[PDB]
Amino acid sequence: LYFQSMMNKNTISNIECVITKPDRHNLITVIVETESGVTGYGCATFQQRPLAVKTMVDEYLKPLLIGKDANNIEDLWQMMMVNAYWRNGPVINNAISGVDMALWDIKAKIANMPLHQLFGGKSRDAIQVYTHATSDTMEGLYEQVDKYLEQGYQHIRCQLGFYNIQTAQNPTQGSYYDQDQYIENTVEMFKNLREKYGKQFHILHDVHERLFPNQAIQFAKQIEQYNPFFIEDILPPSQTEWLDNIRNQSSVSLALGELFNNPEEWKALIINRRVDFIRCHVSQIGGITPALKLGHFCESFGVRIAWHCPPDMTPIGAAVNTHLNVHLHNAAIQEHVEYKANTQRVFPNAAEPINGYLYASEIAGIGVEMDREAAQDFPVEYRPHEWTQSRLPDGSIHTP
Amino acid sequence: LYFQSMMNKNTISNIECVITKPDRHNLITVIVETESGVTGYGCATFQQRPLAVKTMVDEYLKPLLIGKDANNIEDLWQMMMVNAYWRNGPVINNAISGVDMALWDIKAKIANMPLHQLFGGKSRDAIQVYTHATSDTMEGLYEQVDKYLEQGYQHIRCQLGFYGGVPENIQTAQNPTQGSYYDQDQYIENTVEMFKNLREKYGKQFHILHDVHERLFPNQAIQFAKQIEQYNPFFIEDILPPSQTEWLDNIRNQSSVSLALGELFNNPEEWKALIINRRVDFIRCHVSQIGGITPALKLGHFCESFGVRIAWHCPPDMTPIGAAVNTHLNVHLHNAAIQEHVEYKANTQRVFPNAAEPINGYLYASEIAGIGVEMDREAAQDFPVEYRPHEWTQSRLPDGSIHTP
Amino acid sequence: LYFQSMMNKNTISNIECVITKPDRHNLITVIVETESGVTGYGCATFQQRPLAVKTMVDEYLKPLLIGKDANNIEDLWQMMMVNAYWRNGPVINNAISGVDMALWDIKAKIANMPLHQLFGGKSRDAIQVYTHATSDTMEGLYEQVDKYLEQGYQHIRCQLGFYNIQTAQNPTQGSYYDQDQYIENTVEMFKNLREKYGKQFHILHDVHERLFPNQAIQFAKQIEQYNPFFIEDILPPSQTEWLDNIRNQSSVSLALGELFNNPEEWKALIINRRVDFIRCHVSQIGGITPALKLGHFCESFGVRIAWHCPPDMTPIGAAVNTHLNVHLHNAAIQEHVEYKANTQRVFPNAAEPINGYLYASEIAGIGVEMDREAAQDFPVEYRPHEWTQSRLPDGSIHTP
Amino acid sequence: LYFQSMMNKNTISNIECVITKPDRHNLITVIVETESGVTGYGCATFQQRPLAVKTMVDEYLKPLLIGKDANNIEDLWQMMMVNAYWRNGPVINNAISGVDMALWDIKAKIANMPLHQLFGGKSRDAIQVYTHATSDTMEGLYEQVDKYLEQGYQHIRCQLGFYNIQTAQNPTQGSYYDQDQYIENTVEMFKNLREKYGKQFHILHDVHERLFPNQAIQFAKQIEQYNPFFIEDILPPSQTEWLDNIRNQSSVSLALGELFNNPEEWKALIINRRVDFIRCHVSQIGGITPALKLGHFCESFGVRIAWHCPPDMTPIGAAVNTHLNVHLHNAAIQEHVEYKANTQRVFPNAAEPINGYLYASEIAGIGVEMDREAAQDFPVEYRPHEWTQSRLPDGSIHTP
Amino acid sequence: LYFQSMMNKNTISNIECVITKPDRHNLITVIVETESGVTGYGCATFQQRPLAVKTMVDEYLKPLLIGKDANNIEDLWQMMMVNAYWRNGPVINNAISGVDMALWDIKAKIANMPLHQLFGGKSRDAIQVYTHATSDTMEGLYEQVDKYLEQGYQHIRCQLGFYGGVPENIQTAQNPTQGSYYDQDQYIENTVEMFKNLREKYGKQFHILHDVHERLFPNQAIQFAKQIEQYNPFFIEDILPPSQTEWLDNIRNQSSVSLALGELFNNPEEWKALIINRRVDFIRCHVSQIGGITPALKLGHFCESFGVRIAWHCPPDMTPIGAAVNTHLNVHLHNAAIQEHVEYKANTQRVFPNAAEPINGYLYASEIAGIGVEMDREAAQDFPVEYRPHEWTQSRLPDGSIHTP
Ligand SMILES: [Cl-]
Ligand SMILES: [Cl-]
Ligand SMILES: [Cl-]
Ligand SMILES: [Cl-]
Ligand SMILES: [Cl-]
Ligand SMILES: [Cl-]
Ligand SMILES: [Cl-]
Ligand SMILES: [Cl-]
Ligand SMILES: [Cl-]
Ligand SMILES: [Cl-]
Ligand SMILES: [Mg+2]
Ligand SMILES: [Mg+2]
Ligand SMILES: [Mg+2]
Ligand SMILES: [Mg+2]
Ligand SMILES: [Mg+2]
């Protein structure tokens, strides 16, 4: 029996990690080569610290993995996760995710199946999509909304304004906003959208952890009459116990989790039914392997899935999410931001929504790869992401 | 080298406690001297019982502390707290607070740093400030609000007030027991109308705070929370007495109202369940009532883990030394939210020079070595202690029964 | 109706506070005089800080109370408790206790009844008594035990040793002990007592908050086979949530509460059935008025009462406790330490146990007063109580 | 010491129980005579089953008590409560209550004090009073309200209507009502009262266990805007766990407990803060002795007291409640229904409210007794109380 | 005066990160220089992935921090922690820890005080120490124990060991996957026998510690707790992996065994429920894994409220700078219990001069200004980073499956 297994083993021959910045964001791809000549591609994108992820892959995951059998995705995932002893966290998990996704790509290519078919097939025809409408005026928002409705979108995440104020003398360098102004403007945004559009479309909004708990609860009560499809990240991950007070008195639909990279962040959240949609970034939790398990975990508790799909993610990562989304029965919706020309050249054949739906790739594997030569035209470039130094008017840091 | 710890010791050589009443309140300062000639100042102000605090310092803390190394504030705090066996409470804690703050003052002076820099430095540029607008009339209230708005305050605690004194328009029994009478229903009605009027006139121009000051029974507190919820107060303070805070769960389950509580606290059992269960949004402890800077730091950290923010009690019955200490705590602790402030009068400013006043709605921490505010001993002597009965604490409902004041 | 009430009002004419040290401890008595000529006596003994209690009575309670009607004990208690705004704590509560007990003394004298009869009468004939056997050798302990058994005591609190060790260099000044040695010696004490005496008498022991929580639980499991009547203060008051782990796995009987002076310290303790005997010092909780309420509170929860009755308490305080003990149905046992001659002269007619029982006074009032002239022969003397600077071998403070 | 006690013992020489019906209700008084010649009076009124209470007193409590020392109220209460082994319940508790109150009467008479002074004195000057306004029209209600406001009452319990309907064929004999009609009419009553009177007075209403739990919660939400002083008996005692759902979503003030005669009915209720006012009928819980303990228990939990004071109770019972009400710090309000001439003759000197307040008696003892000769003019008369056969339209019994 | 805050600023002028391997482990030091010429040193040691930490410091923390005021440690910590949006975790936290410790070093040097004195001084004279006795034989174990007892240690962590490597006497499948094999039942049996033998030989002469090191499944952990309970270990460490600590309730409900856990923690969600529910007696966090001194102070205070004591992880894979920092934390925080220690070798002592060693079972805090231990840059260059695979982390059970290592 060991001959047969070995007759079919698939030895890893190389591991590489490429950072590319075709457009606005540093994107990170892991490429796994095997003795069988089948090559896999994975997303490892942690856009704020890409060199750290590349160091992790090149200096540590590569010598660990060369020579091991790519077939055994589950063992290699369990092994990689604990390999540095200390574990979890964004740098390690993204590096592992790149490998994990590439291993799944390889297995699906070898099975001659689209990735979602390897999982067990479709439980939906396609996944609904929401887009981002952001403007500093209501009329700018209306213009973007009108355009999206025309394209067939039924769900749109709307944000008014961008985030004067009474600071102290000589305020510390940072990115300032005012929580009360943000709340006022957002409630007014919803009120205006409902007045103009009624129930034409589902309105989403991302609070992006900008509030204190007392403000979050007030906001939930102020916004609930407008029936948002979901309110995202109404609290930071360290304060989700405060969601119980919201759940006890508001019917507002809640989404949370794009920041998660440790299972302790989500277990009590889900067990206690504190959110309606889990928003994890697949590469932050360690790839396809844990995403499947988390999807199953959520299903048991009646929690639905809306994986984080920001511009700072490869089209490979986006394709993987669509595979997960057409497969997992509790997947709800896929976030999408239009790809630009440079990105499309580096990652050919990336799907775009058609009439409000994203369709899974139907060729073998993930269905999207990286053009290595094209990636070279757009190397990594340092960006400070100053918005993460978010400060309140008194000069103190708030979670960004 | 073996001798280095002892070489840098700073030996406590004297402890003094001075009561001074420059204006309306008996203030209590503790002064600690070292053999090296460094002097620290601390606040021990429990205004209602100042001679008791002074007895505590002079007769008990003084013989305990003289000769010991001031450097080891943490040991001296742990030791002081359990020194009488029985512990906690307003008299012991205030005496200990005066010493603790003075020891921190000494350490900061020896470090040649402002107090907040010893802690680990600033986590904000300055602390926002709220003031008190109180009047027996709405027009009088508008007048005070307009004044503070002119000075750049964005937060004002408003009381459409007078609750106490003779029972003028109150249906008491015949021959009511002497006391300070009020009617809970009138207070609630007036307060709801106050918020409604304030929002109609000012809209969202400023944040409105209000102190219930433990005047209500639990069923009234829950009703009140629902009645003012729509007016979005920055916080409603002391909606219940410390002994009834489990009733806050009922409010948390059905109202979004922001709650502050805790100026009365002097025992950790009063705040632990409160914070663990997220029953308030702001903790309001009086730093000297909980035993000083040492436990205030720990409590601030404890609150931060649970997402509770800090608004230390800063009434006129506290020394400007106490106020400066709070501003140091407030620019340092990341979860500090706002500092209460009442303007200092001339006599008080003379006894305690260089007391900071708000600028455009902010209080700035002192930047010289130490706490930054001391007591002028000669000036304090011009204003000796003067007994005050504080008759408002004999608070009675119309039927003549005591209610928590 | 107001004439009649006033025809019977009893105006307070004077309040005094006397500290006296006839023997080992500074004792504090409050004396309340009334226009009716009836004088009451109360205990306010907080032995470690007596001048603070006297300042509280003389400078604050006296001007508050002169002129008020002594009949209305309940109103005056409610009023006194909140009079300084901030409240609870040992200095205020002892001062109030002295007044409260004196007011009850006056009411019982006016009713021409023993205090316990004013309460509603006896629910037992007399209260059982336990005594203190403390020695540094087992044979010294045996000698004291033998003497107590001969006198008819059925309950004896036994302590072996007094509380070498590996400290750091130049250990800080303090009162050192070793927790492991204390545990070892105490377990051996119980083992030896059971071997020599079997079930002849009930063995009590006071841990006196000397242990950390993990040590407390180990000790409970080590000691339970010896069936102590109770183990007292196995944890300090700030750590009583740890009693749940003991309650979940040990049958050991627990007593706690002599340190309490804030109701928040006892409410969760009792509601959660974390102790079997409440040990409050009546003057620390504010006198007879709150002691009655707490006794009733405990009864509802099946908790029994063993009020703290140390040498540092007046014989007036002891008589009050015996009145409470023969009245409250859930009273269990009274701690007693023999009075010495000077103390007996200052407080005449103090009851002593007879055949293991203390009997309540049967004359009008509390039944024990202070001889003012005798008290003058023994004025206050400063004592540092150095044992409260209790340190572990590494030089750190532990609750004493 | 035993001589002195015995020198002051007060031996019970006789126990009698008289049922009298001066006006609308069978009232029950227990009379206790002592060797000292001091006679006590107590209320034992369970109006629906008076002969059962009289049998209990005459045939069982009398031979148990003759010869025992009346001074020891607490022991005699503890002893009586368990004397039949099985215990609790309305017949036993009322019989015991009559004795208990009479024993307290005797002790206060011997102390030469009003009962509330024996307790520890006043914590209020007098107790506020609420009255009953009941009519089948709104204008009839207005007339009664106007009259009460003129007399100085500030609290009035208002009920509209009395409690056509679609029953089955040949509906079973009983007292029919319709829950939906009752709810509709009561909400409309409150709406009209607030429209006419605004905040002139506090409005109380008694649901009297007429609703199912889902109806109770709906009613609480419908009524809360009208700020009732309290809504009484919104659920029957066996369903008070359903109060948690009301407490989680409504601010309505709740009162409950007139039906209670077993401590298990109130412990979880109070511990869990499910009501704001406890409404126990003192004789149903066993007299003054347990009423004091329950008052103390409630105080710890922040629950206030409004003892049941219906017409079916002696003026002796009413006087006792006023003594309890001026003494217990957490007493809130006293229910009162005007006495008629026959009742006043049988029980002379019964207090009536003055300007919305009831004042405690100031003579020695309870202050109200029974005229034995006058009581004889009004012997017991059978009444079926048919209203207790309360049926819903389908013919099923509901708690009455 | 308005300018005083800015006048006393200490501007960060450079940030460096050095990996050195003087002996068995890759150690990571962060060095922060100020424009004033003050230099601080900090520990960023995550031994398994050192190049990743260095990339994090050099490429990201360096451009973030240069130019900012080092004085405001609290702000800089709060800002650093959220700076990459995604956060927590071993790479980011270790890089931040190196900076944080160096900023505290700078502040203490500027104060001219030992680090623990900035905190508020000592609450004990010195911290008790435990050592490691590990052997593949009981006789070898006795030899090491006897040695430590001679040196005056009263606490020793004992492992009757070797669990890993080739599957010699283990019933694996045919052709087992490459890894470090162990058998849970053999480990449990050997460990119980070890305690039994130790108690028979030594009685109560010393406190016995043991590290389960997450080798067991939950049902095995509960069984093990009951099996060794009678031997009264000072603590049993890491009886479960961090992801399974809810299973500790079962143990707490039925065993008196003392538990320690947490060296793996790098996210606050891992410890909050743990401490709130009193699931351990000692917290074992690795200070650099949680982000440095700043959060270690807060966590120590948090633990104190719940009665949990502190035993920070102090393995050989940490700089002596990290060790000195822990000793400062340990003499200051009142709930610190014990410090793990492994003797420093010659090369390590050369790269990090003046590293303290225990004296009679105690470690003493440094008494010079700052942390008290720095890195000799020239010496560190003699020992550049060297890759190590750490094969023991590929821990496998007999059937070939991975278990937490
Ligand atoms: Cl990481
Ligand atoms: Cl950028
Ligand atoms: Cl009036
Ligand atoms: Cl005054
Ligand atoms: Cl006090
Ligand atoms: Cl002494
Ligand atoms: Cl019955
Ligand atoms: Cl009838
Ligand atoms: Cl094998
Ligand atoms: Cl290795
Ligand atoms: Mg988002
Ligand atoms: Mg206030
Ligand atoms: Mg004791
Ligand atoms: Mg009723
Ligand atoms: Mg370990």
Is A396 an interface residue toward B (CB < 8 Å)? yes
Spatial neighbors of C364 by CB under 8 A, at least 6 apart, are: C108, C109, C111, C112, C113, C114
Determine the residue type at A21: K
Tokens 């319709």, residue located: D178
For residue A380, the SS3 value is: coil
Spatial neighbors of C131 by CB under 8 A, at least 6 apart, are: C148, C153, C155, C156, C157, C335, C336, C337, C338, C353
For residues A166 and B120, the answer to whether their CB atoms sit within 8 Å is no
Cα–Cα distance, E345 to D221 (Å, whole number): 74
Chain E residues in contact with A48 (beta carbon < 8 A): 60, 83-86
Answer yes or no: do E125 and C221 touch at CB < 8 A.
no
For residues C306 and C334, the answer to whether their CB atoms sit within 8 Å is yes
Give the CA radius of gyration of chain C.
22
Is E123 an interface residue toward C (CB < 8 Å)? yes
Cα–Cα distance, B112 to B38 (Å, whole number): 12
Answer yes or no: do D123 and C75 touch at CB < 8 A.
yes
Q: Which of C184, C212, C396 is facing E124, going by the closest CB pair?
A: C396
Cα–Cα distance, B338 to B313 (Å, whole number): 10
Report the DSSP beta bridge partners of residue A155.
A130, A202
Tokens 């190389």, residue located: A14
Residue positions of A annotated with a catalytic role: 163, 208
Q: How far, CA to CA in Å, does E93 sit from each of E43, E170, E295?
A: 11, 39, 11
**Positions of E strands within E257-317:** 259-261, 282-283, 309-310
Cα–Cα distance, E251 to E223 (Å, whole number): 9
Is E404 an interface residue toward A (CB < 8 Å)? yes
Three-point CA angle A80, A84, A85, nearest 5°: 105
For residue D46, the SS3 value is: coil
Phi, psi of B41 (to 5 degrees): -125, 145
Nearest to D339 by CA among D317, D367, D361, D306: D317
- CATH assignment, C1-114+363-400: 3.30.390.10
Is A92 an interface residue toward E (CB < 8 Å)? yes
- CATH assignment, B1-114+368-405: 3.30.390.10
Cα–Cα distance, A176 to D264 (Å, whole number): 58
Report the DSSP beta bridge partners of residue D12.
D34
For residues C89 and C96, the answer to whether their CB atoms sit within 8 Å is no
Task: Check whether A132 is labelled as a binding-site residue.
Answer: no
Cβ count near D180 (within 10 Å): 10
Spatial neighbors of E282 by CB under 8 A, at least 6 apart, are: E235, E258, E259, E260, E261, E308, E309, E310, E311, E337, E338
Identify the sign of the CA torsion C261, C264, C265, C269.
positive
Tokens 């059998």, residue located: A69
Answer yes or no: do A82 and E174 touch at CB < 8 A.
no
Task: Check whether E237 is labelled as a binding-site residue.
Answer: yes
Q: So where are chain E's domains?
A: 1-114+368-405, 115-367
Cα–Cα distance, E18 to E10 (Å, whole number): 23
Report the DSSP beta bridge partners of residue B132.
B157
Answer yes or no: do B367 and E1 touch at CB < 8 A.
yes
For residues D206 and D394, the answer to whether their CB atoms sit within 8 Å is no
For residue E34, the SS3 value is: strand
Determine the residue type at B176: P
Cα–Cα distance, C392 to C211 (Å, whole number): 10
Cα–Cα distance, D288 to D99 (Å, whole number): 10
Cβ count near D358 (within 10 Å): 24
Spatial neighbors of C329 by CB under 8 A, at least 6 apart, are: C123, C124, C299, D74, D78
Cα–Cα distance, C94 to C55 (Å, whole number): 12
Cα–Cα distance, E174 to D399 (Å, whole number): 74
Q: How far, CA to CA in Å, does B38 sit from each of B13, B34, B112, B356, B365?
A: 10, 5, 12, 23, 21
Q: Which of B122, B253, B360 is facing A249, going by the closest CB pair?
A: B253
DSSP string, C185-212: HHHHHHHHHHHHHTTSSEEEEE-TT-S-
Is E81 an interface residue toward C (CB < 8 Å)? no
For residue A43, the SS3 value is: strand
Residue B206 DSSP class: S
Chain C residues in contact with E128 (beta carbon < 8 A): 393-394
Nearest to C56 by CA among C15, C27, C22: C15
Cα–Cα distance, B322 to B138 (Å, whole number): 32
Phi-psi region of C253 (alpha: psi -120 to 50; beta: other; left: phi over 0): beta
For residue E46, the SS3 value is: coil
Spatial neighbors of A276 by CB under 8 A, at least 6 apart, are: A230, A253, A254, A255, A303, A304
Cα–Cα distance, E333 to A112 (Å, whole number): 61
Cα–Cα distance, A46 to A312 (Å, whole number): 8
Determine the residue type at B40: G
For residues D319 and D367, the answer to whether their CB atoms sit within 8 Å is yes
Cα–Cα distance, C341 to C350 (Å, whole number): 11
Task: Please name the helix (run of DSSP H) or strand (run of DSSP E) that holds residue C289, with its range, or none.
Answer: helix C288-301
For residues B65 and B15, the answer to whether their CB atoms sit within 8 Å is yes
For residues D177 and D390, the answer to whether their CB atoms sit within 8 Å is yes
Q: Are strands D155-160 and B339-340 parallel, antiparallel or unpaired?
A: unpaired
Q: Which two tokens stand for residue A274?
A: 């504190």
Which residue of chain B comes nearest to D330, CA vs CA?
Answer: B401
Nearest to C256 by CA among C274, C282, C283, C229: C274
Nearest to C69 by CA among B164, B182, B400, D366: B400
The number of residues in chain B equals 405
Ligand 11: centre distance to CA A206 (Å): 6
Phi, psi of E346 (to 5 degrees): -55, -45
Phi-psi region of C227 (alpha: psi -120 to 50; beta: other; left: phi over 0): left
Is A289 an interface residue toward E (CB < 8 Å)? no
Phi, psi of A337 (to 5 degrees): -120, 130
Task: Check whether A338 is labelled as a binding-site residue.
Answer: no
Chain C residues in contact with D107 (beta carbon < 8 A): 117, 120-121
**D interface mutation test: which of C76, C127, C270, C296 has the most D CBs within 10 A?**
C296
Cα–Cα distance, E165 to A197 (Å, whole number): 67
- Report the C-alpha dihedral over residues D291, D297, D302, D308, rounded to 10 degrees: -20
Q: Which two tokens stand for residue D126?
A: 């007098």
Cβ count near A67 (within 10 Å): 11
For residues C261 and B269, the answer to whether their CB atoms sit within 8 Å is no
Answer yes or no: do B177 and D128 touch at CB < 8 A.
no
Is E60 an interface residue toward A (CB < 8 Å)? yes
Cα–Cα distance, D66 to D61 (Å, whole number): 9
Q: How far, CA to CA in Å, does C31 sit from each of C38, C88, E36?
A: 11, 22, 68
Answer yes or no: do E359 and C217 touch at CB < 8 A.
no
Q: Which of C55, C264, C397 is facing B51, going by the closest CB pair?
A: C55
Report whether CATH 3.40.50.300 matches the domain A115-362: no
Cβ count near D78 (within 10 Å): 15
Experimental method used, please? Answer: X-ray
Cα–Cα distance, B44 to B289 (Å, whole number): 8
Nearest to E53 by CA among B24, A52, B138, B146: A52
Phi, psi of C319 (to 5 degrees): -65, -40
Cα–Cα distance, B112 to E120 (Å, whole number): 15
Q: Which two tokens stand for residue B42?
A: 């601390």
Phi, psi of B19 (to 5 degrees): -100, 130
- CATH assignment, B115-367: 3.20.20.120
Report the DSSP beta bridge partners of residue C277.
C255, C304
DSSP string, D337-373: -PPPHHHHHHSTT----BTTEE----SSBSS----HH
Count helices and strands (H / E) in chain A: 16, 14
Q: Which two tokens stand for residue A73?
A: 């995705």
Answer yes or no: do A214 and B362 touch at CB < 8 A.
no
The b/e string for B300-336 (b: 16+ C-beta within 10 A; e otherwise) is: bbbbbbbbbbbbbbbbbbbbbbbbbbbbbbbbbbbbb
For residue B165, the SS3 value is: coil
User: Quick one: resolution in A?
Assistant: 1.8
Cα–Cα distance, C174 to D257 (Å, whole number): 57
Chain E residues in contact with C212 (beta carbon < 8 A): 281, 307, 309
Task: Check whether D205 is labelled as a binding-site residue.
Answer: no
Q: How far, CA to CA in Å, does A312 sit from each of A43, A104, A210, B157?
A: 10, 21, 20, 46
DSSP string, E330-345: HHHSTTB--EE--PPP
For residues B177 and B400, the answer to whether their CB atoms sit within 8 Å is yes
Cβ count near C161 (within 10 Å): 18
Helix axes D288-301, D90-110, angle to 10 degrees: 100
> How close, in Å, is residue C61 to chain D by CA atoms?
19
The distance of Cα D194 from the centroid of its chain, to the nearest Å, equals: 28
Spatial neighbors of D222 by CB under 8 A, at least 6 apart, are: D183, D187
Task: Check whether B313 is labelled as a binding-site residue.
Answer: yes
Determine the residue type at C226: Y
The b/e string for D253-280 (b: 16+ C-beta within 10 A; e otherwise) is: bbbbbbbbbeeebbeebbbebbbbbbbb
- Report the C-alpha dihedral over residues E37, E40, E46, E49, rounded to 10 degrees: 0
Phi, psi of B96 (to 5 degrees): -60, -40
Q: Which two tokens stand for residue D106?
A: 């005797």
Q: Which two tokens stand for residue A254?
A: 């809640």
For residue C366, the SS3 value is: coil
Q: How far, CA to CA in Å, does C324 sit from each of C39, C118, D287?
A: 21, 11, 21
Tokens 């921090």, residue located: E65
Report the DSSP beta bridge partners of residue D159.
D134
Cα–Cα distance, C193 to C208 (Å, whole number): 20
Task: Check whether D208 is labelled as a binding-site residue.
Answer: yes
Identify the sign of the CA torsion D191, D195, D196, D197.
positive
Determine the residue type at E123: S
Q: How far, CA to CA in Å, does B149 sit from each of A392, B311, B401, D14?
A: 21, 21, 40, 78
Cβ count near A225 (within 10 Å): 12
**Positions of E strands within E195-345:** 207-211, 235-237, 259-261, 282-283, 309-310, 339-340
For residues C372 and C360, the answer to whether their CB atoms sit within 8 Å is no
Spatial neighbors of C149 by CB under 8 A, at least 6 apart, are: C156, C200, C201
Report the DSSP beta bridge partners of residue C114.
C365
Q: Which of E85, E87, E402 is facing A75, going by the closest CB pair?
A: E402
For residue C168, the SS3 value is: coil
Q: Which two tokens stand for residue B221?
A: 């507190």
Cα–Cα distance, A283 to A93 (Å, whole number): 7
Determine the residue type at B8: N
Cα–Cα distance, A28 to B328 (Å, whole number): 45
Q: Which ligand is nearest to the CA of E405?
A: 15
Three-point CA angle A163, A166, A168, nearest 5°: 110
Burial of D67 (C-beta count, 10 Å sphere; 0-12/13-18/19+): exposed
Query: Please, where are the H alpha helices in B45-125?
Result: 50-56, 62-65, 73-82, 90-111, 115-119
Helix axes E90-111, A90-110, angle to 10 degrees: 170
Q: Which two tokens stand for residue D385?
A: 């109380």
Cα–Cα distance, A79 to A85 (Å, whole number): 10
Cα–Cα distance, C155 to E177 (Å, whole number): 67
Q: Which of C166, C212, C239 is facing E361, going by the closest CB pair?
A: C166
Spatial neighbors of D59 by CB under 8 A, at least 6 apart, are: none
Helix axes D315-327, D288-301, angle to 10 degrees: 40
Spatial neighbors of B119 by CB under 8 A, at least 6 apart, are: B297, B328, B329, B332, B333, E74
